[PDB]
């Protein structure tokens, strides 16, 4: 929310970050003056743009489900780590081993001598697959740190500044971009131009 | 590349890689015909 | 590349197919996983062009 | 045994008119598992609103099953006459895994009276009857349908108000029209509605009594009855067998209005049911009382994986037969009545073996039968290359006491062809069976006879009869119980273990037969031989009445291979597709006259792996082989409009046939041609350009919208 | 720490005149953030 | 039916041998053999068996084979000896062939109700039945 | 013992046949699952690139 | 390492008028020294305060 506060003044720039307090409308007339290089006579005569900007954000309100990935990427993430956690942990327990009723021959079947044999099957297997889960968490942790450094590269470029570059700042001469916290990640509402 | 087969390479290997003979594994086509990737670029 | 398991393992022999039927979860997770991999790759091709 | 009431006192049976053509109707009621037709609820546990994939006994989607119909009998205006039945009693079916039965489906609708086709009537539910057992054959006059020993009979009674289940010997009776009498056509059951189904006084033994006219029931182990409330509601019945016994299922008690089947009985029948028949019933109505009786339908069960959709209240109201086609597979292979819209790869479609080429006379077991089998440590070795063997021939001479194999079975070792057979034979007592083992560290494996662990092996213990006289016995059985070296230090002892396919180092000092149990042998070693001593000790077992022998077989299984097959136009050229079976190896290939790479004096050619690519053996040409043909099929599901469309991978618009009969797996039970830009598709139509583009976005460039 | 650093406006119900911004906090997890937290399962 | 090929008929679990139809309830003499020609429907060829004997002992000697199934459902089968019943509204339970540790609650209302568990897509039971007759749905520890 | 079907007929008794075949299915499908993990790796790195 | 080449060609030669990567503040100088297995940067940034 302080980032949304700094959208207007920081999107000016003239340096990151030693600034400012400028209203959001004038921030989008300078952000719009920049790369959609329509100078002042068009944004003066006329605005409403404002109703087209608000219309754009309105369809950005209505459309999340289902055919609008990014959003299916979001539930690919929540279903990713929820799937890995709960569903892989459901594969890890109940059942894996050769005789695998939670405790082999738990308290109810034989044999006290061979109990250590079947149990040691279940521990070597169950702990080995747990170690596969740990290797997997290291993988998605490292890739999550790569993508988080990408998000820091998308906040410092596309969110503060404009950023005069193509997608990353998706599909069109970029104008504004907004950040909201999604499940596990950020989430961007890149407001781009579309000539047509 | 020893591949691919798209209605000439399956039969062409039948006249004799084995994505279409073990089956087994199987290679899917790359979503775009070569003339059209050529059209993009 | 997608593997067509339940006939990769096994070569197509009925006893071995039944012993796969004991492992009917794992094969589903294999071909499910590769079909997901191809949709992610295919969306990389589509989104790229 | 149980009292099942008196025998019939009738001296004849009711005459039975078999007219199969009157019962030949097409009234299709195929399995629709979408509506949960033919579903037994799982035994192990029960479930709430959950969906799942589950493997159990189910009928297959679209199975029409076998239809059966029961008819009013012949009658005048006043008097029932001959029974009127189909030919069901002679049609004995294999039980296999059991079956489920759709009962009463047409009840309330209008249908024919069967025996009078021009006469229609309201259809009423009727219950089926079954005869099941372990052994069948013919009646005295030669007609089929006789069940021997204890037989399970499931017979409804009381105008459809009870089921009787009983397990008895069925003694055919000898009066006229009875199964051991004159003028027998078929047995049947019947009831007489005018006297058996009067209000408040149903005859609960009418059908049983009719059955007792054709058979005396003997030594019944049980007779159970299950009461049924009278209605015209559709129901399902099922039967399976598990070691406990025969299990009966019904929708009636737990899901009367929905059809799911649940277990209501386990019958103590532990002899495996292999056969069943439908017992024909005929209704002894008079002409003015004739009704139409609902056909019933029997569908065989098999182990299949279904998607099961459980409602909140726990019942199954929708299922998918996953193997029905690729669309259902996708539908399932996901555990989901709904499979998101896309391309989903389902497996082949492998071609059928035709023209099984065999390449190879008569193996010479001679010198085994003539003389005295030596002692285990002097085992004689017969080698077999390039010949045909009748081994079950050889093992029919002897009396065989034990047959165990390693990495093979006795069944398998008779059948398969091998490059390098070896037969080792010797005298050996049955008393020492525990020492002749592949998993044994006795003296036999240590110092006498050891097989290879890298090849498949068999071990046979036999006894020469008397009938065999060219095989002479020796004084006794002998074996080595110690073979060691004493080092030149006079007190390090090092056992000399025998290596596979070799004799003991002690055979030079141990006589061909040991003179007395426990004798010991010694031999000082030359400084070149290592110095010290060689030492051995022999054991004896008393000779038996009939000589007892040991046989060790080793097959290759190589390596160097080929030409040793069993013995018994088509098994030669030109089998220009699958299959072959060379003496050297199995396999499935498409031979072609290729050129020209090989060795050419030993026969095969490999390519850097286990495979053979592949010529030799033919005489003498280059029939280079290939791997099996597989059609790499897929499914184009489109769940929005629910329209599957089977795509083949890359072949062919010309080579396929619709519902192709040269190939194995749809997958698997049932299947269901335009290309040719990618491959062949079983889906119309040709381009049709150009839109839009979007998913579900098939391969190279068919963008395939729907519908 | 590489997000905030400096310096908000602060959050007043009127951001831009007249750009109807849903990204306002109603009051604490703004409205579009409420949509993509409610619709995610 | 080729008069050459011999195929052993192996007994399947919890079934009788296919040869019990031709082998007497007691074998008369060690090594006796039995035969029975097969109908073309039965497969043709022959069925063949051979019996062995061991001399009767002073005291009769017997064999017992027991097979247990853990429930799952019915009819139930425990040893014998407010407690071991309700209201044990925390850990532990020990039902018919099934162990476990759960917190029973009077829940509603999903099941089969004829056989007496309910699972949720895994080995676990979530979890009512058995009480008489109510819905004591269980949970994990 | 891995002549593409473990003792299908030939090389071992049917009841054990299931033992050697289940070795071959656990192993062959496990290594197939390693292939699927590898395809996920090079797919994700291919999407990065 | 390709990132380090992207940090040498941007942050070390040029200035680079971009935020972190060139860490925390309007970047001014940056220095490179070889660390164990890697490079090592001594990014000299501005800090208003």
From TrEMBL, chain E:
Positions of the record's site feature: Cleavage: 29-30
Protein name, entry field: Spike protein S2
Parent sequence residues shown: 851 to 899 of 1353
